[PDB]
mmCIF file of C-alpha atoms in Angstrom:
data_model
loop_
_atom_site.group_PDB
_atom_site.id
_atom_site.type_symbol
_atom_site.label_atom_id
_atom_site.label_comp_id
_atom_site.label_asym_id
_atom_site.label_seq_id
_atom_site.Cartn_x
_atom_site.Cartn_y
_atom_site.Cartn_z
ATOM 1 C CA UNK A 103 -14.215 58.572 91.378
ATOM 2 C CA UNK A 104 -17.031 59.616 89.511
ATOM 3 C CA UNK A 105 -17.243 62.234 86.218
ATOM 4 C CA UNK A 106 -17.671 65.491 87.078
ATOM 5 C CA UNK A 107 -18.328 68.913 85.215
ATOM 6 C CA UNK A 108 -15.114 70.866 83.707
ATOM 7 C CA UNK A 109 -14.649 74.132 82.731
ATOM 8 C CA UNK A 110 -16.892 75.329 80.024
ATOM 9 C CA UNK A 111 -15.634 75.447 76.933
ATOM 10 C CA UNK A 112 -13.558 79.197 75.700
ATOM 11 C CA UNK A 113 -13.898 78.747 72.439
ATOM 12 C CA UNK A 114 -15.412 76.426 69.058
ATOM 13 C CA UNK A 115 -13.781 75.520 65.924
ATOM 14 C CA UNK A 116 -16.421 73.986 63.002
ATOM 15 C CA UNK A 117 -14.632 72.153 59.876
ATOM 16 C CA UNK A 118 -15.954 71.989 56.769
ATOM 17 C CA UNK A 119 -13.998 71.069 52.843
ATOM 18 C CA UNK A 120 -14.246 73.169 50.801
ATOM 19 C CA UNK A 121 -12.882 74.100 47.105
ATOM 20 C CA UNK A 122 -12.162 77.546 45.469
ATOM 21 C CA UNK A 123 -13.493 79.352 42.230
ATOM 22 C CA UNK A 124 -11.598 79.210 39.124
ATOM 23 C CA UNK A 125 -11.679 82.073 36.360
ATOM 24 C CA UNK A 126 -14.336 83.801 34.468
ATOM 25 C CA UNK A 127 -14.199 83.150 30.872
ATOM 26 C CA UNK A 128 -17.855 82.418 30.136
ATOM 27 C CA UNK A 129 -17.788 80.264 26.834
ATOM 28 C CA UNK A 130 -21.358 80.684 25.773
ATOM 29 C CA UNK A 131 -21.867 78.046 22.613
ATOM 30 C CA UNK A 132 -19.717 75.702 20.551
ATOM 31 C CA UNK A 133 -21.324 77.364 17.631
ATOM 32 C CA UNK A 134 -21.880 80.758 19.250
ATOM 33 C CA UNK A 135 -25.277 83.021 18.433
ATOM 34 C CA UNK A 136 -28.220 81.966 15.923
ATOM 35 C CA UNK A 137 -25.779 81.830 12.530
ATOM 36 C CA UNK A 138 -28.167 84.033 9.972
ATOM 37 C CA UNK A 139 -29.773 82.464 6.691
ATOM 38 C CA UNK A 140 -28.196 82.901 3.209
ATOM 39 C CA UNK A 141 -27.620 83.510 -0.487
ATOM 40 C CA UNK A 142 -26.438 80.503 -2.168
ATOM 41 C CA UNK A 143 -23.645 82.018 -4.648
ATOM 42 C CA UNK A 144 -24.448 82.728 -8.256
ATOM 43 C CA UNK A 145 -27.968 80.980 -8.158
ATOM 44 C CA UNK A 146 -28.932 81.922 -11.562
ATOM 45 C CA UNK A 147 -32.371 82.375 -12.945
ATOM 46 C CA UNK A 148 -34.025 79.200 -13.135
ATOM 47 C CA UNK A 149 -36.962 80.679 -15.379
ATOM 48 C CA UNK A 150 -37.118 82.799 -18.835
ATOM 49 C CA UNK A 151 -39.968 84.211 -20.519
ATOM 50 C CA UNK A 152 -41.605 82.763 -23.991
ATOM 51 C CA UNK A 153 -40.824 84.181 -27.081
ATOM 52 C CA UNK B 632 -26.424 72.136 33.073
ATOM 53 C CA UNK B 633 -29.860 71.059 33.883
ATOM 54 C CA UNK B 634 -31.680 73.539 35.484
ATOM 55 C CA UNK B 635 -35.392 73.241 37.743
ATOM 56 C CA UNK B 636 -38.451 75.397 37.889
ATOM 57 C CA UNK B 637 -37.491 76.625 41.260
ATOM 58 C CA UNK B 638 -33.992 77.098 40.404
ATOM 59 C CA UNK B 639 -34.337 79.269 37.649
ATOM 60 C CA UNK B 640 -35.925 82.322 39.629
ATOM 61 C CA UNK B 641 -32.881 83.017 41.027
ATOM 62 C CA UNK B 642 -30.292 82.867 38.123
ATOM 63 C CA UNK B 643 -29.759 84.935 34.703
ATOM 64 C CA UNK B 644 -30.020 82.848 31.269
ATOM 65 C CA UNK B 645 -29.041 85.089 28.471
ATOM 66 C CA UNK B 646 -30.736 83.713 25.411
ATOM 67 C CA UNK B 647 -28.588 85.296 22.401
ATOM 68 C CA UNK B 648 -24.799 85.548 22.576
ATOM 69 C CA UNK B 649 -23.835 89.485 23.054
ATOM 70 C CA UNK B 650 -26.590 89.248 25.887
ATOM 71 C CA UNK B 651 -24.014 87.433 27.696
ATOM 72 C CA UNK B 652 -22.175 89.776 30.647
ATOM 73 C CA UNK B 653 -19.381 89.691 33.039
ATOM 74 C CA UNK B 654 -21.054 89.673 36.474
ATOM 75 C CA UNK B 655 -24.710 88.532 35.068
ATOM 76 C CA UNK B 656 -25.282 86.176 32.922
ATOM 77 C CA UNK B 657 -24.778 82.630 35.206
ATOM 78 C CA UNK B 658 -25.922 80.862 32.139
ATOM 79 C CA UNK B 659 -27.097 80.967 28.656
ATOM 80 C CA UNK B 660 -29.887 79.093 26.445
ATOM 81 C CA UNK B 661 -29.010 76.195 24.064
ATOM 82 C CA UNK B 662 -30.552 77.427 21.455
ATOM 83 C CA UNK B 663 -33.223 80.475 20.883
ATOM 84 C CA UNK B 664 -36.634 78.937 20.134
ATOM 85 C CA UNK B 665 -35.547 76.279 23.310
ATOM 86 C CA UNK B 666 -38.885 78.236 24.849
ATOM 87 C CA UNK B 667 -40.944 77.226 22.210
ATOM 88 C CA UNK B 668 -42.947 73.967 22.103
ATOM 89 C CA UNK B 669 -42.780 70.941 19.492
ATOM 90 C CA UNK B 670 -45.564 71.899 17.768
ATOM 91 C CA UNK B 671 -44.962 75.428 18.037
ATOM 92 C CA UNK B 672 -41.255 75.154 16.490
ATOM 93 C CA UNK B 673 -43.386 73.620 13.016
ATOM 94 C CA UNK B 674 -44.787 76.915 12.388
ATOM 95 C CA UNK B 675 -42.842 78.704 10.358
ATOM 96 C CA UNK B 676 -42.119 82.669 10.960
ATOM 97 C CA UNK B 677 -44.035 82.461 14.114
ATOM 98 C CA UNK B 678 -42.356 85.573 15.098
ATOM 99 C CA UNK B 679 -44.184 87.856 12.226
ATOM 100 C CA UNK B 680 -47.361 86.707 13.489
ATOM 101 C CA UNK B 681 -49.809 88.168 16.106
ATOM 102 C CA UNK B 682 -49.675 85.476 18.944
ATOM 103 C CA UNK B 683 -53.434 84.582 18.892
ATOM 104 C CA UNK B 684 -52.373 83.269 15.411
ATOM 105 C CA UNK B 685 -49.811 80.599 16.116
ATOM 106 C CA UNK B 686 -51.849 79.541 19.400
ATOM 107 C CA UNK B 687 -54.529 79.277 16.912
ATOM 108 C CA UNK B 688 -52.197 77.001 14.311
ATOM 109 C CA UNK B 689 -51.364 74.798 16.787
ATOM 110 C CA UNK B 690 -54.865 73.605 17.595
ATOM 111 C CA UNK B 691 -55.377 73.474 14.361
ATOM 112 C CA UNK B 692 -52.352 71.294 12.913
ATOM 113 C CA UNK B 693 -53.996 68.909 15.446
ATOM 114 C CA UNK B 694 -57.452 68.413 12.871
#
């Protein structure tokens, strides 16, 4: 009446969750790259010589 | 993301967009100078300089 030893085991199963990849699209920046310094339009001399 | 010391070795950061790739390229820099300390980022051109230079103005914006 006791508990005795079965048959071992054939095989196991291990479960673990698990969620998938999604695709590449790689958005870098809002504002992408370092934006390069400028002329301000017109400008104009601000300087003449005397005479 | 926020990335850690030990995390970093084994990841690519592109630091200019058009260094980005398809397969490489994990993640990217906020912005360029991001390596670049406080002090350092208060010198201006620091690039057209020798580095012993703008090691040298930041011990000396300091006196």
């Amino acid at each position: 009446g006791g508990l005795t030893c079965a048959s071992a085991p054939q095989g196991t199963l291990r479960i673990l969750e698990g969620p998938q990849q999604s695709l590449s699209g790689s958005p870098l920046q809002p504002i992408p790259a370092s934006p390069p310094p400028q002329i301000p339009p017109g400008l104009r001399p601000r300087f003449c010589a005397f005479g | 993301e926020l990335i850690g010391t030990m995390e970093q070795i084994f990841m690519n950061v592109a630091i200019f967009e058009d260094e980005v790739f398809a397969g490489v390229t994990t993640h990217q820099e906020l912005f360029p100078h991001s390596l670049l300390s406080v002090i350092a980022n208060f010198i201006p051109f620091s690039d057209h300089n020798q580095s012993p230079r703008n090691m040298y103005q930041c011990q000396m914006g300091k006196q």
